Design a protein around this ligand. Structure first.
Ligand code: CL
Ligand code: CL
Lengths: 305, 305
């Protein structure tokens, strides 16, 4: 048993991480300047809450988690550093949660948010109530449960995030590879591409890499990936393909072709080929997980945008 | 359920990995040019064995493992590449085994082999029959069991190995950081040091980093490690220390000081302060794991060299 202490536990990105850790059985304490409904919920769920910051609040903690909104002058942080207690940024602890669950990491420069939401929507339609991470915020749509209760954790994997390479997913998507975040990698696109290869090799040999081969950079690195892979796209050589794209209103329809399955007609309330591709990525993951066609259809059409 | 196929399964570094995978419940097949006692043992334990190489041998495999002794012209490898089956080097699969066990990774430029052996010796004295990896070879001293049966996997972690950063240990030792393998890191020692920091951050936040602070480079990076750490050495500021070093024959005696424990007198059949330090590293790990003083004393004195 360990105690994790959160400095600023009421912050929007912190409260969700504390709740997941509570759900996993850890002792959780936290400090914040103001009591709120967020801190009362955490206390109801087993968190010890302190109001105001003082060195005593950090006593007994085996780890501190600190936001990007805390000075090092903060007495709790300073006490932990003096006693050699580890202090970890919010984002590393967030990435760490995937080690306890069946982690689905949605990587790619664009489309992570939509693809993660579609995945959550489909899993929920299949009765699975996943916890999912968008913009650093843990969520579980309509759940009557603590965050992290599901077996599944679906998270955006941002290549500009310092913890990108410490994610340990079971399944990983790569929607596309753009140059937006070259600065994270010394302004070198080739280094940025190599990071995506290393990220996919954090998968276990039984894992699954879900690769958009309509993106030329994803297609380029594909031969480098020594893990099971399923490819998707409109490309005629993709494993999972969309054909017969059409509109009926603000709703996009298309037919998805999958290995050893009959063609499946789906719709989504979102325009553009990039959202057809995001739907394909979702369909691959859901198919790999054994989710029925009926939940896939329901999950895709029910998502709004 | 997955099937792993080993090309050259009788090779010395391959047979042990196949046995561990069998113990974990996977289907395992393998090909080799010659039947031997190694391949008959694997067959007795559930492996399907083929003699000679041909593309048919790789059928149904979800992954191939290939030695560094196989041409790409090898028909089994070629068949797998055509069908998009993942082909992984022996060393990556070996590192992967740590994900299924309580992994203890013994890193550092020098002293990995001795320290790993001492750890195994002490754990065995405590009745724990660990599997351990030295020189790429899986071993379990005097075990009446399949490799990998123990909860514990103790392995050398070599910084020149391509899989160094894909190890997922629960505990990690760093004996020292030397410049021997700078070439692996573009001939830059500072890059080599940064890799050791990244390696220790593969630990979980509940993990343990065991750090020799007698090495100036290990002491330098220590403030960077945001994980629980225990330090050891002759330095007076080390958490776990050796004092009163003395000889009686070819046997080295010393007293180990540990936080909140009485001083403990130990001996080892090996000369030099580097083997006192390797013993300290062992004592820290064994103490953290709850192993008794009597097994620690027995494990250290029983090891020969
Ligand atoms: Cl491959
Ligand atoms: Cl720290």
């Amino acid at each position: 048993h360990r105690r994790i202490h959160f400095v600023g536990i009421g912050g929007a990105g912190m409260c969700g991480i504390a709740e997941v850790l509570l759900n996993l059985g850890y002792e959780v304490s936290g400090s914040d300047l103001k009591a709120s409904a967020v801190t009362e919920r955490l206390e109801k769920f087993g968190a010890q809450i302190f109001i105001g910051h003082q060195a005593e609040n950090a006593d007994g903690a085996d780890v501190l988690v600190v936001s990007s909104a805390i000075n090092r002058a903060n007495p709790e942080v300073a006490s932990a550093l003096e006693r050699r207690i580890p202090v970890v940024p919010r984002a590393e602890m967030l990435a760490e949660l995937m080690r306890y669950r069946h982690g689905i990491a949605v990587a790619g420069t664009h489309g992570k948010t939509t693809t993660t939401s579609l995945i959550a929507s489909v899993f929920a339609a299949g009765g699975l109530d996943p916890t999912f991470v968008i913009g650093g915020r843990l969520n579980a749509a309509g759940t009557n449960a603590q965050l992290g209760a599901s077996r599944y954790l679906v998270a955006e994997a941002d290549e500009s995030d310092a913890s990108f390479l410490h994610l340990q997913p079971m399944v990983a998507v790569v929607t596309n590879i753009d140059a937006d975040h070259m600065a994270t990698y010394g302004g070198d696109f080739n280094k940025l591409k190599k990071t995506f290869v290393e990220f996919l090799h954090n998968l276990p040999f039984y894992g699954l890499a879900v690769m958009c081969v309509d993106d030329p950079v994803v297609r380029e690195i594909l031969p480098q990936i020594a893990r099971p892979t399923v490819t998707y796209g409109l490309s005629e050589d993709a494993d999972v393909r969309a054909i017969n794209i059409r509109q009926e209103g603000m709703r996009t329809w298309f037919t998805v072709l999958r290995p050893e399955r009959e063609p499946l007609d789906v719709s989504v309330n979102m325009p553009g080929l990039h959202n057809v591709l995001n739907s394909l990525a979702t369909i691959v993951i859901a198919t790999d997980e054994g989710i029925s066609d009926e939940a896939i259809v329901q999950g895709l059409s029910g998502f709004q945008g």
